[PDB]
């Protein structure tokens, strides 16, 4: 048994639904019911004499994907109707392209560093943010600082995001009255 | 008179002129002395022959004052032999390390 790629697709959406080798090629395309299509490639062997017995494990290559759950919120990122921000119940914020579907990219949730230098809390096993109730994007100062302000399900602070970097921001705005965030806005 | 001397003295015991010039001006003292010609310090190589000159002088102080101060001593080499096993596996564990990065 060469290798096992575990959790290559979600079991709840069907597992790996079709996997096929492109023939003559060391690349295999998988697709699952979680709205995802991946490719995995076999690199050539690392031993220069044996080869057939030292099989390097398959690594990841390109993939396309979308939301695995129906989206819960929708906004347009700019006045040109090129990108649109889209948040789903599977707790991901995607930025989908209306012009060319290769440009669709998941906004990353990799947090910044704390401003003073203290530790940030949270679980070690990183999971995605609670699913997005509302959002408000105003790209007047885009690239300059935080640009999207978003409000999640049953939590008392609103995160920010940067659409230029396509990532989370440094700030989570609290409500200061122990109430969940019911709306967000931002000025132009 | 050798047994009632500390192990640092037994380390530097041969190198008195280098020692006291390096103390009477504020310089770095020798590390070998008369104990440099032991076979274990011969087996060591680098700065760890200073290191095992130190551990060899410590175990030699142990064995030496055992020999001078024992009364039920047996002339069989037991304390010296277990001390030598301690010094040999210590020399092994600091010749096994290497300052290179692999």
């Amino acid at each position: 048994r060469i290798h096992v790629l575990k959790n290559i697709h979600r079991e709840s959406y069907g597992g790996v639904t079709q996997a096929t080798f492109l023939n003559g090629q060391p690349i295999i395309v998988t697709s699952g019911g979680d709205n995802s299509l991946k490719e995995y490639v076999f690199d050539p062997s690392l031993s220069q004499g044996s080869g057939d017995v030292v099989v390097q494990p398959p690594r990841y290559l390109r993939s396309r994907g979308g939301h695995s759950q129906p989206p819960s919120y929708i906004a347009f990122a700019d006045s040109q109707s090129h990108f649109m921000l889209s948040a789903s119940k599977d707790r991901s914020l995607w930025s989908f392209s209306l012009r060319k579907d290769a440009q669709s990219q998941e906004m990353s949730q990799r947090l910044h560093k704390k401003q003073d230098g203290g530790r940030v809390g949270g679980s070690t096993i990183k999971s995605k943010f609670p699913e997005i109730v509302a959002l408000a994007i105003e790209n007047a100062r885009i690239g300059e600082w935080e640009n999207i302000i978003t409000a999640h399900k049953d939590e008392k602070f609103a995160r920010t995001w940067d659409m230029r970097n396509k990532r989370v921001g440094r700030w989570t705005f609290d409500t200061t009255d122990d109430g969940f965030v019911k709306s967000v806005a931002m000025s132009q | 008179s050798l047994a009632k001397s500390p192990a640092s003295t037994i380390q530097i015991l041969g190198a008195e002129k280098a020692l006291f010039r390096a103390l009477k001006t504020k310089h770095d003292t020798p590390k070998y002395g008369l104990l440099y010609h032991a076979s274990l310090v011969g087996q060591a190589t680098g700065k760890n022959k200073g290191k095992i000159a130190r551990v060899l002088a410590a175990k030699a102080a142990v064995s030496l004052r055992y020999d001078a101060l024992a009364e039920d001593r047996d002339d069989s080499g037991d304390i010296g032999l277990e001390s030598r096993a301690k010094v040999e596996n210590r020399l092994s564990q600091l010749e096994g390390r290497d300052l290179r990065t692999t």
Partner: protein, 387 residues
Amino acid sequence: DESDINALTKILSTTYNYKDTLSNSKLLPPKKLDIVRLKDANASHPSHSAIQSLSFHPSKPLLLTGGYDKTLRIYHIDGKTNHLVTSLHLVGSPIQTCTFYTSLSNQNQQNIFTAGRRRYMHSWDLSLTAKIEKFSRLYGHESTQRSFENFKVAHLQNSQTNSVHGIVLLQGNNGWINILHSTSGLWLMGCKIEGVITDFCIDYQPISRGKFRTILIAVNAYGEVWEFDLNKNGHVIRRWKDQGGVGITKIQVGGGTTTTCPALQISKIKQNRWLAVGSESGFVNLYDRNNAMTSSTPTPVAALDQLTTTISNLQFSPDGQILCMASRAVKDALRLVHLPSCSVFSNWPTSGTPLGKVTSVAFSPSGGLLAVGNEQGKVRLWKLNHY
């Protein structure tokens, strides 16, 4: 080539996991814990002082916290929402030790005994107004007991009837332990050790059907340990010496029924296997009483040295497979040492565990669940997924 001593090759080509699965383990794996963090237990209602003592209920899902702000709080604990059951503020009486007592006869009393640096000790009778009584009479022995701080509650059998009753045990000045009734407050007996009494613990051993025997285990500061049989008159049966150990702060037993894992039914009383003597340098000797009740200079099965300042808590998990060393002197000084292997778990606590300055610790009797109270006034709560 081919169509379809090879037993190992076949079992490897069929298996995909190679370790024991979930419940066919029944005893803890060493060196890697499995411990999730729950909601902080006193997060619902904050404490106004360092949390000096902490005890679970023997049966109910209740956690009693208490500290120098002279109030004691009971929390219904669960995973999500640890709420506050009730809360009693004794004015002018800061509390230092607070214990759920539950008798063996009917298991229906549910007293809380609490005490601090005072010449009295309160006893709240749990009734869900609040009827509390005050013990303030040493029946002729007030000179040798000037503060009710260090007490422990235990069970005692009459040994001519099969009638048990609770005793509280007060650590006094000279070498004295004053044992007195937990309902009437009558001074029953006293046990004097020779030196500076620093701590003590209670061991039980069964004898026959429905009869057990209570042993008080009291340690000098120097390291010599007395064991008193006290189901008879409080007479010494064994006197031994801790190997090493010069400033001795805390002794504990474990592996059977301690005062912190209490037995609900008299036939469920067990003999303790382990005995940990934790010291001022942070050294914890660990003795195995399945063989170290005979030697009279017994050697420890291991001397742990992992945390370097004064041992102020050491508690055994109810199964008796984890010991918890803890120090209130520096921050984050808590270790969970697995035993019989006598090896500290290396994956918890990490550098980011919010342990704080650990000034109390408690183990749940059923859930497999740590509560750790620090000097900021916070009980943090963890669940061990082996249980």
